[PDB]
Amino acid sequence: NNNIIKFDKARFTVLTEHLIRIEYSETGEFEERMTQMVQNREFSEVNFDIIEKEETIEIITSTVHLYYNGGEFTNASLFADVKFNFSVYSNRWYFGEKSDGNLKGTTRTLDMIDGECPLEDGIMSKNGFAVLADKGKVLTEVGDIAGNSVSTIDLYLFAYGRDYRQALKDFYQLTGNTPKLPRFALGNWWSRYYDYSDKSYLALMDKFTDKKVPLSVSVIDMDWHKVSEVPSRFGSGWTGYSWNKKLFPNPENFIDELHQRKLKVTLNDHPADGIRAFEDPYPQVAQTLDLNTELEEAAKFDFDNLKFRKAYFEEVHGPLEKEGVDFWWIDWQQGAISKSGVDPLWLLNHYQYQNAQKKHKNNIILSRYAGPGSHRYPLGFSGASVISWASLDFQPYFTSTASNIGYTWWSHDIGGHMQGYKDAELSLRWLQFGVFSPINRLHSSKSEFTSKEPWHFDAVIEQSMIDFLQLRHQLIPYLYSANLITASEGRALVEPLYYEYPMEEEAYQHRNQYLFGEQLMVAPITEKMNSLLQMGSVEVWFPEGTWYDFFSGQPYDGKVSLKVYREITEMPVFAKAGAIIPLDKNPLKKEEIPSEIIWKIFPGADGEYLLLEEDNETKAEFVNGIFTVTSKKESSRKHTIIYGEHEIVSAKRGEFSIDLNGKEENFDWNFSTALFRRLDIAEISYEQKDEILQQLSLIEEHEKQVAFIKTNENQELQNSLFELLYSGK
Amino acid sequence: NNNIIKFDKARFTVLTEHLIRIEYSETGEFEERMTQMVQNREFSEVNFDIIEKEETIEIITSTVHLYYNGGEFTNASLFADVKFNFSVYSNRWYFGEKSDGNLKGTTRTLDMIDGECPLEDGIMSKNGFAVLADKGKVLTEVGDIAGNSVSTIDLYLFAYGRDYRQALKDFYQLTGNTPKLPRFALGNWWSRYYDYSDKSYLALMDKFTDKKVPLSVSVIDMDWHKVSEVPSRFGSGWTGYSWNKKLFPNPENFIDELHQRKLKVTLNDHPADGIRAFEDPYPQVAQTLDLNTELEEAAKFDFDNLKFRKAYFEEVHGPLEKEGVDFWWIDWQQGAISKSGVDPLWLLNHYQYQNAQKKHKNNIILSRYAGPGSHRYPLGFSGASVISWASLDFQPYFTSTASNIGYTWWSHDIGGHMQGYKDAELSLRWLQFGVFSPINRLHSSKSEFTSKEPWHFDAVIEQSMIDFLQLRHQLIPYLYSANLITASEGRALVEPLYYEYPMEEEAYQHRNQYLFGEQLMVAPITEKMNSLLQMGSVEVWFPEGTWYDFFSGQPYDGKVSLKVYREITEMPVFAKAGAIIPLDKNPLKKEEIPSEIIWKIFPGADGEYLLLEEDNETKAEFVNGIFTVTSKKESSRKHTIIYGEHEIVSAKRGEFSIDLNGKEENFDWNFSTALFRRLDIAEISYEQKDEILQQLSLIEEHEKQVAFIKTNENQELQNSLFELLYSGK
Ligand SMILES: OC[C@H]1O[C@H](O[C@@H]2[C@@H](O)[C@H](O)[C@@H](CO)O[C@@H]2O)[C@H](O)[C@@H](O)[C@@H]1O
Numbered sequence A, B: 001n002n003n004i005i006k007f008d009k010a011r012f013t014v015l016t017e018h019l020i021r022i023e024y025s026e027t028g029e030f031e032e033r034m035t036q037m038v039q040n041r042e043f044s045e046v047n048f049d050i051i052e053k054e055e056t057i058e059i060i061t062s063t064v065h066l067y068y069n070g071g072e073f074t075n076a077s078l079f080a081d082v083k084f085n086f087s088v089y090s091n092r093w094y095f096g097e098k099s100d101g102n103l104k105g106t107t108r109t110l111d112m113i114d115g116e117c118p119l120e121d122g123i124m125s126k127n128g129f130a131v132l133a134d135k136g137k138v139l140t141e142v143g144d145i146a147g148n149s150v151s152t153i154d155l156y157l158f159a160y161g162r163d164y165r166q167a168l169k170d171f172y173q174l175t176g177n178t179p180k181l182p183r184f185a186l187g188n189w190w191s192r193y194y195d196y197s198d199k200s201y202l203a204l205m206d207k208f209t210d211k212k213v214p215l216s217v218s219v220i221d222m223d224w225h226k227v228s229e230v231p232s233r234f235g236s237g238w239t240g241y242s243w244n245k246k247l248f249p250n251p252e253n254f255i256d257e258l259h260q261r262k263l264k265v266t267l268n269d270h271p272a273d274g275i276r277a278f279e280d281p282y283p284q285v286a287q288t289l290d291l292n293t294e295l296e297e298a299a300k301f302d303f304d305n306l307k308f309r310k311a312y313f314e315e316v317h318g319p320l321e322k323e324g325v326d327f328w329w330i331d332w333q334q335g336a337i338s339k340s341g342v343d344p345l346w347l348l349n350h351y352q353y354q355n356a357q358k359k360h361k362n363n364i365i366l367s368r369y370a371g372p373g374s375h376r377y378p379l380g381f382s383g384a385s386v387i388s389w390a391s392l393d394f395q396p397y398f399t400s401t402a403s404n405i406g407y408t409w410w411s412h413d414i415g416g417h418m419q420g421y422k423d424a425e426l427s428l429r430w431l432q433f434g435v436f437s438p439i440n441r442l443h444s445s446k447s448e449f450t451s452k453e454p455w456h457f458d459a460v461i462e463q464s465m466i467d468f469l470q471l472r473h474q475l476i477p478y479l480y481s482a483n484l485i486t487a488s489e490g491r492a493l494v495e496p497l498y499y500e501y502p503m504e505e506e507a508y509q510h511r512n513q514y515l516f517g518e519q520l521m522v523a524p525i526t527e528k529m530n531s532l533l534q535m536g537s538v539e540v541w542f543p544e545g546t547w548y549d550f551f552s553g554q555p556y557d558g559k560v561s562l563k564v565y566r567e568i569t570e571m572p573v574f575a576k577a578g579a580i581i582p583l584d585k586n587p588l589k590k591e592e593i594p595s596e597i598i599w600k601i602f603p604g605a606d607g608e609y610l611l612l613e614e615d616n617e618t619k620a621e622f623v624n625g626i627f628t629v630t631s632k633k634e635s636s637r638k639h640t641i642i643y644g645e646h647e648i649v650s651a652k653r654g655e656f657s658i659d660l661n662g663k664e665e666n667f668d669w670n671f672s673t674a675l676f677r678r679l680d681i682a683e684i685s686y687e688q689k690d691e692i693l694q695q696l697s698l699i700e701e702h703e704k705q706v707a708f709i710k711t712n713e714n715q716e717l718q719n720s721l722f723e724l725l726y727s728g729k
C-alpha cells in the first residue's frame, strides 16, 4: 500500500492522519495476522508527507511528526512531535518513555479494593497523543492462538489531540467493535453468595414480583455445586460442575421455573481446579482426554489445550446448558500463568464468548477485564470490591474512565461485594449509581448480613430502592438504543465530561460526573449526608445551556460550578432544554418490547431522539414547539407524551404530530416549596429555620437574598440555600 | 532408588510422602554431595504413584500432586496441587512464585531493630505447603566448601499440611539435628559492653554471689583487648586479639578465678579486620602466612582460605584458649561478601562450631543466624536490639516463629541492647521473658546508664529480678531435658501454639503466647502497665482443659480467650491439670547436677514427666492419684514432692511411690483475697473500691456479680474484675 513505509528494520503504516502502526523485525518479515488486541488493519487511504534521507525518515500527518533515525528502537532513535500546543513541553513522544497527560483506562478487577486503585493508561491524553503497545500473540483466521508475532515490536501511535470520540471510534475499527448486548442484560440482576435451595430461590423471585421489583437475570452463585461435600483429598469445593442435589434435586425443573418467570439464568464458574474425579461430568471428560481414572487423574484447567476447551464446553458446560443455563459467569481469580504466555482470563473470555453464541443470539459472558480488545467479550465483571463509601466514591470515575480503553460494559457489584461496614444510606447511594451505570447487578458476599434485598432495610430505604429498581426497567429502551449505538457507531453509553467538552477545564475536575447516553448528565452523590442538613451533596459543573433536574425540573443556568444537595432518596440527574427521553410506561410488565413509551420532553429548545429497537427505529423530533413521532415499521405501540410537568397525550397509536407551543412549558418546582422542605428536614435550631424562612420571604432583591444567606454561621447551609437561590434567579 | 524419578532434565526424589527434592541439571549430572543446608538425603522408602506420558509427568503422594510438563522450570512447567482444603484457591504451588499462608521463620539479626522487622519464610504454612530452595555450595565429605552444585536448581517441596512437628522433624533429618547443648549454656549469663578490670569483673561476680543471683557464664566484651591503644594508621580497635594489660595484667589468673567460681568464660571476637601488625599473635601469623612484616602486611580476614582459618584457630584463638577461654562469641556485622559467594558469617559459624568441639564436649558458639541449617551451630545471637517496649513486644513472637526454620536456640540481649529509653518496668518484663526463653543472657551497650544489674534498680524491681534470675536456675533441669529432646527427637523447646493446636484459629491469634517444653504455656506481658490498675495485661487463649497459673494456682476453664492482669513482679505462666514440673531445690548451690529435685504436681488429671540428664533418666508418673518416681541408675539424690500447695515428702532418697488421693488437691488462691489485692493497689477512687468490694461480697449469684462489674465506667477495671470472676466461677 502507499500508506506503508519501510526504513532500516522498521515498518510504518499510516492507518489514519492520527494513527500510525510502528513495527520492528530482525528477520525483515512483518506481521499481517490479527493479534489478541488487533482484529482489522484495513483503513481508508489518507494523505501524509515523507522526508526520507540516507540515515533518517520523518512521517508528517495533519497532527504528528514521527521520526526514526535507524537502528534498534530507543528513546533517541524513535520519537514524535505532535502539531498541537496543549502543553508547553510535553508535546514529544519518546519510544519506551511515559509522558504526562494520559487520562487513564481501566484494570482487571476491583477484587479486595477499598476505594481507589491504580489504573492502566488508555488511548486518551490531554496532551493529544498516546501509544498502545501490541504485546499479544498472533491469531489464526478462525481465532486460535498461533504463537509469537514476527513484528517483535508492534506499537500504535494515537495523535488525535482532544478528539477523544474519534480516537475511540478508530480504536474500535482496529480492535473490532463491541458486539450488541441482548436486551435482558440491561435489566436488574439478582445475585447473592448464599446457599439457596430451588424452593427458597423461587420464593425470593416471587417476593420480588410481590414487592413490584422487576428482574431480567437470576444469578446462581457457587453454592449451586458441591462445596462442603467435596472430599478434602481433592482440594477445595471452590471449583465445581456438579449440582448439590439437596438444594437442587431437579435442576432443569428449577431453571424451567425461572424461564417461566422470564428470567435468564447464569451459574458461577470457578474454573481453576478443572474437572476432578468426584465430578458428575468426570467419567465423560476422562474418556475424551484419556485420563487414568484408577489414579483419579484430574483434567487440570488448560485453556491453551484445544481438547480441554472442547471437553469443557461440550461435556462440562454442555449438560448444564441442556438443563437451561443461558450464559456463563466466568469468575477467575487464580493468576495470569499459562505455558503459551497468554493470560488464562483472556483465553476464557475469548473462547467462552465465542462458545456462548452457539446456543443464543447476541449472548454474553460475565468476566473480569482481560486487556485492550477484551471489550469484544462483554460483560465486564469488576469483582470483590470492599463495601465502603470510599469504594462507591471511586466507582463512577472508574466506570467513565474505562471508556478511554473502549471497555464500556462494566458490571459492578451494586452496594459493594465484601468486608467493609453497614450503612443503609451507602447501599441506597450505590444503587442510585448502579441504575445509571452500564449494568445494574445486585450482588454480595457470603455474610448473613450483606443481602441487597430492598426489604433488608427500613421502610424509607426499601421504598427508595424499589423506586430506583423500577426506574432501571423504565430506562431499558434508552439503554438498549445506546447499546446498539455502541455496537454500530463506537460511542460509549458512559462518557467522561471531556468527550463532549474537551476544551473546558471544569470537564477534567468532576471525576464522578458523566454523560449517560446523549440526553442525560449524572452527578452521583458518593459521600455520607451532612446530618445537620439531612442531605448529601456533590459539586456539579453545568455546561453552557439551560439544565433541568431530570426528576424535579429544578432549573440551572450554565456555565457554572455549583454544589447541589439531595435527600438520600434523590439523585442529581440533569437534562438540557430540548432533551427527549423515552421511558417504558409498564416497567413491571413482562413483554419482549414495550407496548407503551412515555416521551419525556424538557422545554426551552429543539431536540430529537432516535429509539433503536430489535425490529424498529422510532424518531421523536421537537422543532419550533411541534413534537413528531415516526417509525420505520408500523406497530400497535401506544405513545404517551409528557411536556415538562403535564401528560399531553395518553396511549396514542401510530405516527403523529402535536403542537406544544400553546402548552405550559414551566415545571412546578419552586423556590418557596424547596426552601421550606430543606429548612424543615434540617437538624438545626428552630430560631434559625424561622429567621431564614422569614428573611428570604421578605427580602425581594435576589442580590440581598444572597447577601442574607452569606451571613449564615453554617457554611454548608449557606451552600444549600445558595443552590436554591441560583436555581430561582 | 525406586524413590528417584528422572524426566527431561529434571530429577525428583520422594524422600517422604510429604517431602520431594526437585532438581534441574543442564549437564545430565545431579548432585549427591551435602550442601551448606543439606547433610542427609537417606530416608526410608515410601509409596507413591506416577502418571508418566511422552511430554508430562505427575507424582502423586498422600498429600501432593507434583506436575512437570518438561523444558526449563517456569511457573507454567513446574507446579503442585496439595490434597488439602485449608484454603479455597491457595492450594497450588507454582515454581518461582510466592503463595499465601507461610507462618514465617527468622532472620540474621535484630541489630538496629526497634520493634518488628520482616522475617524470611519458614517450612510451615497454614495452607499446608512450603518450598525450601537450596542455593548453597556443595561440601566435601569432611565439610569444606567444594564449589557449585551440578544441580543448578535444587528445591525441597514440603507438603505436610498442618503437621508442623513432623515437618520440623524431617527438616532436621534433611539438614541434620541440632547438637546437644552443655548444661552451663542454660544458666544466667552476665555480659556488658563495659571496660572492666580483672579486679572489678571479679568484684561484680562476687557481688552476684552476695546478692543470691546464680550465674553459669561470664562474658567479657571487646574492652578485653586493645581499643584506644591501637594506632589509627591500623584503622579502629573494633577487631582485637591482644589483652589490654592495664585491665588484665594476668589473663590466665583472671580466667582461673572465674573457673574457681564455676563460670564458663567467653570473649567478644570482631573478626572483620583480621590480624594486623600491632597484635600480640601477629609475628606467628605473619610467619605461618608468609606476610611482608617490614611493610606490616595484615592477615586480612579470609575464612575461604584454609591457611587463614588454621592460623586463626591455632595461633590467634589457640593462645587465648590456653589462658582458659572456654568458647567464642563471634560478633560479625560486616556484611555477606566473599570470593567464594559463601556468607562469611556461615563460614565462621560452621568452622568455629566444629573447632570448639576440640577443647570441650558439646561446646557452643554465640553468633548471628546464617540461614537454613545453621541451627547445627548453636547458640543464636540476635544482637543490637533497640531498648523499647516495641522491641520486647516483638521478641516472644520472633522466638517461637524461629522454630519454623528449626533455629530454636536464640539468645536475645535481655532488656535490649542499645539506644531507646529507660523504664525499670521494661527491664523487669524483658527479664521475665528471658527466663522463659531459650537462653537468659543479660547484656547491654557502652552506656554508663544501661547496666542489667538488678541493684541498678529500686528495691521492688531488684528483688523481682533476683527472684526471676533464681527461677532460671530452678528451671535448668527442665531446660536440659528439653535440650536433649531437641537434639534426639527434633522438638523445639519453644513452640508456637499452632504446633499443639493446628486446627484452632485462636492458636494463630496470640503471637507472643507459646509452649515452653511440654508442661508450661507462657503469655509474657510486653506492654507498659495501666497506671489506674497498677497492672499489665495480655489476652491469653486457654485451650480445652483446666489450667493453673504456675505461680499462684489461679484456675482457668478452657477453652476461652481472656484478658489476664499481673502486677509488674508477676508473669502469666500456666500448667494443665496433671502437669509435673521438676525444679532444682538448690539453684544457688554450685554442683554439676542437682542433689535435690522438687516435683511440682498440678492436681486434677494423670500426668508424667521424663527428666533426661547427662548420666540418668528419671520418670515421674501421676496415675489415679499415685505419684511414682523411678530412675534408670540409682543415686543419692533427694526428691521433694509438692502436690498443689503442700510439700508432701521432703528429701526422700531413691525410687518410691506415694498415694496423694487423700491429700488436699485445691490451691489456696481465692477470689476474695485476689479481689482485695487488685482493688487495693488500683489508683482509682476509694468510693469505687468500697462499692466494688461490698457489692461483689454481697451479690451471691455469679451471673449478677458479672452484671454488676459490667456497669463499671472503667473498661479495663471491668476486664480485670472479669478475669477474677471467670477464675472463681
Ligand atoms: O463465588 C463466590 C464469590 O467468589 C468471588 O469472591 C470471593 C469472596 O466472596 C471471598 O470473600 C474472597 C475471600 O477469599 O474470595 C473471592 O474474592 C467472586 O468475586 C464473587 O463475586 C463470588 O460471589
Ligand SMILES: OC[C@H]1O[C@H](O[C@@H]2[C@@H](O)[C@H](O)[C@@H](CO)O[C@@H]2O)[C@H](O)[C@@H](O)[C@@H]1O
Residues within 6 Å of the ligand: B111, B192, B193, B221, B222, B268, B331, B333, B383, B384, B417, B418, B443, B444, B445, B446
Ligand atoms: O562488642 C561491642 C558490641 O558490638 C556490637 O554492638 C555494637 C553496638 O553496641 C554499637 O552501639 C553499635 C554502633 O555502631 O555497633 C554495634 O551494633 C554487638 O552487637 C554487641 O553485642 C557488643 O556488645
